[PDB]
Design a protein around this ligand. Structure first.
Ligand SMILES: O=C(Nc1ccc2c(c1)CNCC2)c1ccc(F)cc1
Length: 313
């Protein structure tokens, strides 16, 4: 209803919180994903989502899944998001059992990039797990659900015991757990009772498979220090020996597509369409409301990047 700015297609994952519906932006012809939140189901965590959405308006990175449009009806919230055909990182591992060191490295370098960018913008994800890591058609990673139950396995020990934590030192712990599951295909700390799970995280002791290389084991033990003072810093991680073991350059965390100025061709096409001049069109865009204009601009930008003509129907 009312979001007939879009033709609706397939359903690609329902949660008891938010469902995702596939869609097509009428004007641009561009494929999109729609996260459908129900305000009734949220309730005591609506500002949780509003703050999540407000962070997501200020993040423009190649490994962050792009927000196009927010739409809030009487009872529903619609997030219009970058289309990620490739699927989830979680489902990518379970199908390969585990990834090669060389492939984990390729993927890991992308997580580091997305996460470093986020930090530089003065945010921490505070939930890095393979269920938040989507793949595009070019098999590049995109980061989702910035939100902050079964994230207890990926939780930092100082986060567990309600101590004073830094959001980056936590993000580093999470990336250690993720690095483990990438190479092994199972969790380093895992238990049926959640108290014994909490015990193993504090103990800091974990299994090491025979297939793990020494540099791997060594990076893992740098990353899964219980004491946050002892954990590897984000700064030291970008140019780490292991990280640079195949592609001998540090992580390119800097946004490769910054929001700088508005694109000329997009502004001219929106001016002809919305039947007003360049300046009145530019002012209207620069307001960045995450309405249909923001979606049309950002999706015309997408169309331009593909080498398709910068035109609405
Ligand atoms: O576009 C998304 N996923 C997607 C799109 C197409 C297909 C899939 C996932 C998986 N089956 C093949 C087709 C997507 C993007 C963002 C998001 F938060 C949730 C889902």
């Amino acid at each position: 209803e009312l979001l007939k700015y879009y033709e609706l297609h397939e359903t690609i994952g329902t949660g008891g919180f938010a469902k995702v519906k596939l869609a097509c932006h009428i004007l641009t012809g561009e494929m999109v994903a729609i996260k459908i939140m129900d305000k009734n189901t949220l309730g005591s965590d609506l500002p949780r989502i509003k703050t999540e959405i407000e962070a997501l308006k200020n993040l423009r990175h190649q490994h962050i899944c792009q927000l196009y449009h927010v739409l809030e009806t009487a009872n529903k919230i619609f997030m219009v998001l970058e289309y990620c055909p490739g699927g989830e990182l979680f489902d990518y591992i379970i199908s390969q059992d585990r990834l090669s060191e060389e492939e984990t490295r390729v993927v890991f370098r992308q997580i580091v990039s997305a996460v470093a960018y986020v930090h530089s913008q003065g945010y921490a994800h505070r939930d890095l797990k393979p269920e938040n890591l989507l793949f595009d058609e070019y098999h590049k990673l995109k980061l989702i659900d910035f939100g902050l139950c079964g994230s207890l396995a990926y939780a930092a020990p100082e986060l567990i015991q309600g101590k004073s934590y830094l959001g980056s030192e936590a993000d580093v712990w999470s990336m250690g757990i993720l690095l483990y599951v990438l190479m092994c295909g199972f969790l380093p700390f895992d238990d049926d009772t959640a108290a014994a799970l909490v015990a193993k995280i504090m103990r800091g002791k974990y299994d090491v498979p025979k297939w793990l290389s020494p540099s791997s084991i060594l990076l893992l033990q740098q990353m899964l220090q219980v004491d946050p003072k002892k954990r590897i810093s984000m700064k030291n991680l970008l140019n780490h020996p292991w990280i640079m073991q195949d592609y001998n350059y540090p992580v390119e965390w800097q946004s490769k597509n910054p929001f700088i100025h508005l694109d000329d061709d997009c502004v001219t096409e929106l001016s002809v369409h919305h039947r007003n001049n360049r300046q009145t069109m530019e002012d209207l865009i620069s307001l960045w409301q995450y309405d249909h204009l923001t979606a049309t601009y950002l999706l015309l930008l997408a169309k331009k990047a593909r080498g398709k003509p910068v035109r609405l129907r």
